[PDB]
Every structure is written in C-alpha cells, then in structure tokens.
C-alpha cells in the first residue's frame, strides 16, 4: 500500500520541477498533492490526479499513468520552496508518501538585519537582565553569533537558536545574553556580533544613551 516519492529535487528558477509518486493505489485510485512551507499547515495543490483547487496557481499541474503520479511545477520561483506530499485513498485508508523537499537554486546573497534590545526596566525591577539580539532576512541560512562586553568576548549567559526559514525564504535567528542588573549597569556597552558569509555584522547597546 506504500507510496514512494524521492526525498529531494532541486530546480533553477524559471525551470520545471517534476516530483513522481509511485505505489499500488495510484493505478485504480487518484493522487492528491500537498505543499507545506515551513511553519505552516499543509495546503492542497492537486486532487484527483490533475484537478487544481481554486486559488492555486496554474503553474502547478498534475498527471498520472500506470502506478505513477507526477506533480509538475512550471516557472519555479523562490516561494515554491516547500515539502511536497503525495497522498492516496484506497479502501477507507489515507496513505501518504514520505514527502519531497523542493529546493530552488540561485537565490541571491543577503546580509542579515540585526535588532538589539537592552533589558527592559521591568525585567531590571525583577532583578534579571536579558539582552535580545534578533537576526533576520539573511541568506544563506548559516550564521554564528558572538557577544562582547566592552570589546571583550562574553562566554557565559549566551543562548542562541539555529537559523530558520522566514516566509520570504530568507532566514531568521536569535540570541539571548543573560546578565545580572549590576553587570548590565557596570559596562559601557554590550555587542551582538553576527558572522555571515565571511563578514561580521554588529549592533551595540549602552546602559545610558
């Protein structure tokens, strides 16, 4: 009863991607296809082999022959990057394929935008202190984050996420530096430093100012 689709496919922008799905139940029955972007619910793009729901772009189409169904995407764009799942329906059982991760190549480099918040008065009042470094809109999705206190590295109190895909297909990350209020107040500035594609991007905040 299982459905087989390849784990991954890459496409240059403007090119056509085809994702095959094969299995016993596509002979007699029909395939549906879903698109799932990171952080979202699955969205149906093709049903009954070749039917496109209203609201779904015509560049998505579907076909089937034998025990193999194919999802075809024309003029691939960066926003089409997603996992794609085929699904069958036989007796009274929904079957899913393993998903196919579609990769769109050729996306341009983008340096990260950094926002850096000092601890709030309220947190200080609660005798804690957290510096918040928010990193967004970068590509490719690999950065490392380092912190500084007055030009010197800060080892302790650093908590950093791994990058994650934004809606616009660039990446986001964040890093948190925990401090005591007196630490915060005793230095002239603290810096969040993002290393991305061989460059270093820095924001600084000073207790005063």
């Amino acid at each position: 009863s299982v459905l087989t689709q390849p784990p991954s496919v890459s496409v240059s922008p403007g090119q056509t991607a085809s994702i095959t799905c094969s299995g016993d139940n596509l002979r007699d029955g029909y395939a549906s296809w879903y698109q799932q972007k990171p952080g979202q619910s699955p969205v149906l793009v093709i049903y009954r082999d070749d039917k496109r729901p209203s609201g779904i772009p015509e560049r998505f189409s579907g076909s089937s022959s034998g025990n193999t169904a194919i999802l075809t995407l024309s003029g691939a764009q960066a926003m089409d990057e997603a996992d794609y799942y085929c699904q069958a329906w036989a007796s009274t059982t929904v079957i899913f394929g393993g998903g196919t991760r579609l990769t769109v190549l050729g996306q341009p480099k983008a340096a990260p935008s950094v926002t850096l918040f000092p601890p709030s008065s309220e947190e200080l009042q609660a005798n804690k202190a957290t510096l918040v470094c928010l990193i967004s809109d970068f590509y490719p999705g690999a950065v490392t984050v380092a912190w500084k206190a007055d030009s010197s590295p800060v080892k302790a109190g650093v908590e950093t996420t791994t990058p994650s895909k934004q809606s616009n297909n660039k990446y986001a990350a964040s890093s948190y530096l925990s401090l005591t209020p007196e630490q915060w107040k005793s230095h002239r500035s603290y810096s969040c430093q993002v290393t991305h594609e061989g460059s270093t991007v820095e924001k600084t905040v000073a207790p005063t100012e």
Partner: protein, 221 residues
C-alpha cells in the same frame, strides 16, 4: 465553505491520554469525511484515522488501532480524536482535515482542501510553566517588541493589538535554553511618527499553561 478549528496545545504525561477536538463552522460536519493526521517535528505526515459522522463509522490506521479513538458530536458539529498510552513518540502536531463525503461517493476521490490549524501535543514528565512577559521599548520606522521568557512546553502565540496588527510582525522561533525552558521574542516594525499616538499591545498565549498576558509596549522616557 467549511472552517475547522482545533482545541489548544497541551502537555501530557507518559501513560495519559490526549483529546483533540475539531469544530466545524460555516459547514455541517456530517457532510464531510473527517481525517486526523499528525506530524512529529521535522518528520512527515502520518494518518491516524477518519470518520464519516453521517454513517457514524470510523476507520483507523493499522499502527494506531486500539490506541486512537475517533468520534463526532452532531449537536456541537465537532469531531474528536483521543490517543491513549502516550509516549514521547506521540509528541507532534495533530491536524484534522475534511473532504466532502459527496465526492467520496460520487467520484471516489478525496479532496482534503480544508484543514484545522493544528494542535501541538507534547508528551513530557516536566510540568507546564507559564512565561513572564517584558516589553521591548522602541527607541522612518522603529522596531518594538515583547520578550516571552521561561515557559514550557511549546508553543506560544503572540498577536498584536488583539490581532488588529498583522503587518510588520515577526515572531521568532523560540530558543531552548540549557534549563529546559523556552523563550521567544515577537517584534513589530512601525512608523516612528505613530509612536506615542498609536498604542501597541502584544497578546501572549501559552495554551498548555492557560497563560494569557497582554503587555503594553510604550516608548522609553
């Protein structure tokens, strides 16, 4: 023409049972085949089973037979899935999806066009903890935000101005600290000239702990 709305995220201890509900508005539930599908983190879609409230019958995936129970309530237009003897392997987002029963009979095909928003069920021995919330004051445009600190488990939603403000909003995926707790931040970029005239309130929801905090974010001083 049917809106499926699911119950909120929950934490559950190993051994216990979880109930997820899927309520249909703008549509009659018995007009549909309701299907339950889950997704473990970073994994694929897994069928649990389905139900035809019209016929009252339910069918189960073989992996979940005798562990998952799927029912529906006519009077409340609501479907239910219950999964018992939970282990950490059941931590996942559970989805309900509907396809018009009409087409299963007239056409012999599915068209799962309508999906619930999904429900994160975390199976863990660690107790729920609601977050503390702090305003990230703003200093052309300006960024302002809310810091959502020290909660367990995922997830947390943050809206702004009770959902009235959606444009310019970026809620960042949470960090998992060494302490086992999460923190995230949500930031919205607004006009600096609007500051001090328009109000910005973040609405934080941690359903597993039933915490709901509204925090007013004002310019400094």
């Amino acid at each position: 023409q049917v809106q499926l709305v699911q119950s909120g995220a929950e934490v559950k201890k190993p051994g216990s049972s979880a109930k997820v509900s899927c309520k249909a508005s703008r549509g009659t539930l018995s007009s549909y085949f309701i299907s339950w599908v889950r997704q473990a983190p970073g994994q694929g879609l897994e069928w649990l089973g389905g139900i035809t409230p019209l016929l009252g019958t339910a069918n189960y995936a073989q992996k979940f037979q005798g562990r998952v129970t799927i029912t529906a309530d006519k009077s409340t237009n609501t479907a239910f899935m219950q999964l018992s003897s939970l282990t950490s392997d059941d931590t996942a987002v559970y989805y309900c999806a509907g396809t018009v029963y009409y087409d299963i009979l007239t056409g012999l095909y599915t068209n799962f066009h309508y999906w619930g928003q999904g429900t994160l069920v975390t199976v863990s021995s660690a107790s729920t903890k609601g977050p503390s919330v702090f305003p990230l004051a703003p200093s052309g445009t300006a960024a302002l935000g809310c810091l959502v600190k020290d909660y367990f488990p995922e997830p947390v939603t943050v809206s702004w101005n009770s959902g009235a403000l959606t444009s310019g909003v970026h809620t960042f995926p949470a960090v998992l600290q060494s302490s086992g707790l999460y923190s995230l931040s949500s930031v919205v970029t607004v006009p600096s000239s609007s500051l001090g005239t328009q109000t910005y309130i973040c609405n934080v929801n941690h359903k597993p702990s039933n915490t709901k905090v509204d925090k007013r974010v004002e310019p400094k001083s």
